[PDB]
Enzyme design. Sequence first.
Site, PDB file in Angstrom:
ATOM      1  N   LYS A  80       0.842  -1.037   0.123  1.00  0.00           N
ATOM      2  CA  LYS A  80      -0.025   0.116   0.206  1.00  0.00           C
ATOM      3  C   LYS A  80       0.832   1.135  -0.039  1.00  0.00           C
ATOM      4  O   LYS A  80       1.995   1.208   0.562  1.00  0.00           O
ATOM      5  CB  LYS A  80      -0.853  -0.053   1.193  1.00  0.00           C
ATOM      6  CG  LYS A  80      -1.297   1.233   1.719  1.00  0.00           C
ATOM      7  CD  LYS A  80      -2.600   1.626   0.505  1.00  0.00           C
ATOM      8  CE  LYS A  80      -3.245   3.009   0.725  1.00  0.00           C
ATOM      9  NZ  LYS A  80      -4.334   3.505  -0.184  1.00  0.00           N
ATOM     10  N   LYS A  95       3.873   5.842 -10.652  1.00  0.00           N
ATOM     11  CA  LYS A  95       2.543   5.490 -10.699  1.00  0.00           C
ATOM     12  C   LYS A  95       1.898   6.701 -11.227  1.00  0.00           C
ATOM     13  O   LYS A  95       1.683   7.784 -10.390  1.00  0.00           O
ATOM     14  CB  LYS A  95       1.947   5.213  -9.560  1.00  0.00           C
ATOM     15  CG  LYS A  95       0.393   4.845  -9.448  1.00  0.00           C
ATOM     16  CD  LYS A  95       0.291   3.552 -10.435  1.00  0.00           C
ATOM     17  CE  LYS A  95      -1.126   3.084 -10.449  1.00  0.00           C
ATOM     18  NZ  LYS A  95      -1.720   2.644  -9.065  1.00  0.00           N
ATOM     19  N   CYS A 115      -1.960  10.470  -6.302  1.00  0.00           N
ATOM     20  CA  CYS A 115      -3.318   9.980  -5.403  1.00  0.00           C
ATOM     21  C   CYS A 115      -4.181  11.168  -5.678  1.00  0.00           C
ATOM     22  O   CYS A 115      -3.998  12.408  -5.281  1.00  0.00           O
ATOM     23  CB  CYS A 115      -2.734  10.072  -4.047  1.00  0.00           C
ATOM     24  SG  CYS A 115      -3.927   9.894  -2.791  1.00  0.00           S
ATOM     25  N   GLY A 141      -8.094   7.982   1.120  1.00  0.00           N
ATOM     26  CA  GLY A 141      -7.115   9.207   1.890  1.00  0.00           C
ATOM     27  C   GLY A 141      -5.785   8.767   2.343  1.00  0.00           C
ATOM     28  O   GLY A 141      -5.308   9.029   3.433  1.00  0.00           O
ATOM     29  N   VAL A 163      -2.511   3.025 -15.329  1.00  0.00           N
ATOM     30  CA  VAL A 163      -3.052   4.379 -14.579  1.00  0.00           C
ATOM     31  C   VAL A 163      -3.483   4.134 -13.334  1.00  0.00           C
ATOM     32  O   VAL A 163      -4.148   3.170 -12.931  1.00  0.00           O
ATOM     33  CB  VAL A 163      -3.904   5.291 -15.622  1.00  0.00           C
ATOM     34  CG1 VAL A 163      -3.376   5.511 -17.109  1.00  0.00           C
ATOM     35  CG2 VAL A 163      -5.341   4.393 -15.573  1.00  0.00           C
ATOM     36  N   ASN A 164      -3.424   5.254 -12.530  1.00  0.00           N
ATOM     37  CA  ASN A 164      -4.101   5.446 -11.333  1.00  0.00           C
ATOM     38  C   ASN A 164      -5.447   5.561 -11.551  1.00  0.00           C
ATOM     39  O   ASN A 164      -6.029   5.659 -12.932  1.00  0.00           O
ATOM     40  CB  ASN A 164      -3.476   6.466 -10.603  1.00  0.00           C
ATOM     41  CG  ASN A 164      -3.531   6.132  -9.017  1.00  0.00           C
ATOM     42  OD1 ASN A 164      -4.793   6.042  -8.446  1.00  0.00           O
ATOM     43  ND2 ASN A 164      -2.656   6.332  -8.313  1.00  0.00           N
ATOM     44  N   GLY A 220     -12.220   0.250 -12.632  1.00  0.00           N
ATOM     45  CA  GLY A 220     -12.864  -0.759 -13.098  1.00  0.00           C
ATOM     46  C   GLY A 220     -13.130  -0.565 -14.624  1.00  0.00           C
ATOM     47  O   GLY A 220     -12.449  -0.013 -15.293  1.00  0.00           O
ATOM     48  N   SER A 271     -12.225   7.130  -2.101  1.00  0.00           N
ATOM     49  CA  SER A 271     -11.636   8.322  -1.466  1.00  0.00           C
ATOM     50  C   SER A 271     -11.039   7.923  -0.092  1.00  0.00           C
ATOM     51  O   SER A 271     -11.274   8.240   1.072  1.00  0.00           O
ATOM     52  CB  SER A 271     -12.457   9.538  -1.181  1.00  0.00           C
ATOM     53  OG  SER A 271     -11.702  10.583  -0.967  1.00  0.00           O
TER      54      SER A 271
END
Lengths: 311, 311
Positions: free
Chosen positions: A43, A164, A130, A70, A192-193, A221, A68
């Site tokens: 993670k 990333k 992020c 966080g 991709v993120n 997805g 989200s």
Amino acid sequence: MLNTTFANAKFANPFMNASGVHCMTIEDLEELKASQAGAYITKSSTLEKREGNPLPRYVDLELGSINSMGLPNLGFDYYLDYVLKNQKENAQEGPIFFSIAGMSAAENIAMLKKIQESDFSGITELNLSCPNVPGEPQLAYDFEATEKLLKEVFTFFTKPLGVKLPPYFDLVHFDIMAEILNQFPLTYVNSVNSIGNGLFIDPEAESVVIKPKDGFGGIGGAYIKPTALANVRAFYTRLKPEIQIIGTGGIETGQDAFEHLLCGATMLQIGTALHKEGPAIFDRIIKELEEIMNQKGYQSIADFHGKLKSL
Amino acid sequence: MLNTTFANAKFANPFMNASGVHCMTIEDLEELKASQAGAYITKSSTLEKREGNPLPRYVDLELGSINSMGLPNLGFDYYLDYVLKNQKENAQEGPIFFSIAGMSAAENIAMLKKIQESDFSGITELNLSCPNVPGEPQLAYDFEATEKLLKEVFTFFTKPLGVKLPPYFDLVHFDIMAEILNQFPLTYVNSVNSIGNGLFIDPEAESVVIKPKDGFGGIGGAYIKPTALANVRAFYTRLKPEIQIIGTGGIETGQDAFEHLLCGATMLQIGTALHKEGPAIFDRIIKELEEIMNQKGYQSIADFHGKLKSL
Ligand SMILES: Cc1cc2nc3c(=O)[nH]c(=O)nc-3n(C[C@H](O)[C@H](O)[C@H](O)COP(=O)(O)O)c2cc1C
Ligand SMILES: Cc1cc2nc3c(=O)[nH]c(=O)nc-3n(C[C@H](O)[C@H](O)[C@H](O)COP(=O)(O)O)c2cc1C
Ligand SMILES: O=C(O)c1cc(=O)[nH]c(=O)[nH]1
Ligand SMILES: O=C(O)c1cc(=O)[nH]c(=O)[nH]1
Ligand SMILES: [Mg+2]
Ligand SMILES: [Mg+2]
């Protein structure tokens, strides 16, 4: 059939979990180790431990997911201590991946230096995208800031490093980013993120489905495969061959995996689908991909890797 | 029930075709006029007539569509002559919308001046986001260029004007764009144009499905509703009340329409779904929306417009 060479390492297959999914704790990680996944990643971590955003923060959707989180994580030292001790038992084929997502350039540099100084012989992934941290935009969308950070990183980081990236939707952005990245001895690019700040609504209750950021969250997805495939392919035709690619986004079936590989991806990460199915997904998708290969008479990924045809 | 006030004009309902779909010729336009659509808009035009990109350039997908039309259109004068003559018969409730997508800032300024000088009393939409023209990035992604263009436009254009924007995925981008747009006497913002440069692959043939740009094209339909809803909502909470919003993206059912309106959209445009279904879609979706309103006891869009609840 799926044997893969990536970052000068050998993997039984290209499949991995996507950072953020089933990799929060040592227990999650050991479960990925025990699965058929060719490799796994931790993670994204920050210097300090983080509780993350208020719940609900993740929701399964018919066409994917919205989240989200966080950046909830157990802290840099926790993950570092884990990979280091694990490295010593040599209980797996291929190195572990270590994801970092500092709340700032200083935090990222500080973590990269600790990794550089440690005996970590695995692979590192710098998360520049992020999209679920309040008051914090995506670094990879600021081409100047991204280049500035990478230049400093490479004045000292000599270990395998990949980034990333968030999805891009304009061809000139791919040109700009590729030009920026090609100047560095980067090991790889992970596209991709999740598609940033999307929104899902419960029409009955007339409200959003996640509590943070007024319901805005990263989309994953089926919703994003078209975008993910484009990013993998766009970078594949622009990055120097030294920089390999990890395809992430909308991978659920062997067919989705086949498409990503066809675009130019070498390793494949599964997020949303893994979250819904559990580690057992790896056995399933691996067989689905091999069946596709068998029908086409392919015995190795090299038979079609990057061979997507244009009309 | 669906009576709507937009740009100081009255419309029987909020539904319209999305520019580019079923609005290429006078015949397409008259068919939209004869349909139940509350209003309609012409195909984005350029000063000269354009054949567009090589076929295949549009493909229906299970979750939407992918296209790289290349702005095929019959030219500015054709559309202008049409709306002008139609304007004279006063054969419809509510003005026609005129979309323009110049290949350059000079072409856009030139077309806006012709509209300003003409007797056109309808609404104009400036398309700052065509993602299917080779060697031409999206203007709306260049915040500086966008502001520079709009400043020049408003030194002379006094007629109703709205802008067709591409999707944004970072909250700071919404802040930047809103700040830029709020300084102008803009009539509206239309979010969103198709998700740019996505890719679809036929795994069997191992190739892309459209010929131009190596298969890369704008994505529309179910794939993009999360992104479209986010853009409508994000701008709704940032734009000064003088600037209204048109919601576009993934609208297929009365429920999708309900969600967009709940986010803050006043008018709604249908692209992909209209392309697949034909003008008859308007009668269907109108009834679907009224049924949702009836079940909830709503008699007008004002009962829920912009009332999306956060958790
Ligand atoms: C619950 C959840 C948590 C995630 N956390 C991270 C993270 O910590 N680091 C990162 O690089 N990506 C994170 N992502 C994004 C994924 O790595 C992946 O890029 C995204 O979900 C697109 O893949 P998918 O279509 O398979 O879901 C997260 C995604 C989900 C659904
Ligand atoms: C075949 C096709 C042609 C399009 N041409 C235009 C155009 O000329 N101008 C414009 O502003 N948008 C154009 N778009 C995009 C749509 O107006 C709309 O923004 C997009 O399809 C997202 O809506 P949807 O989900 O309902 O398809 C086109 C879309 C399609 C599918
Ligand atoms: O932890 C998160 O919220 C998170 C991080 C990231 O990079 N991507 C995502 O979708 N979620
Ligand atoms: O005509 C096109 O190719 C076109 C223009 C535009 O703005 N959007 C789109 O999806 N296609
Ligand atoms: Mg294993
Ligand atoms: Mg009519």
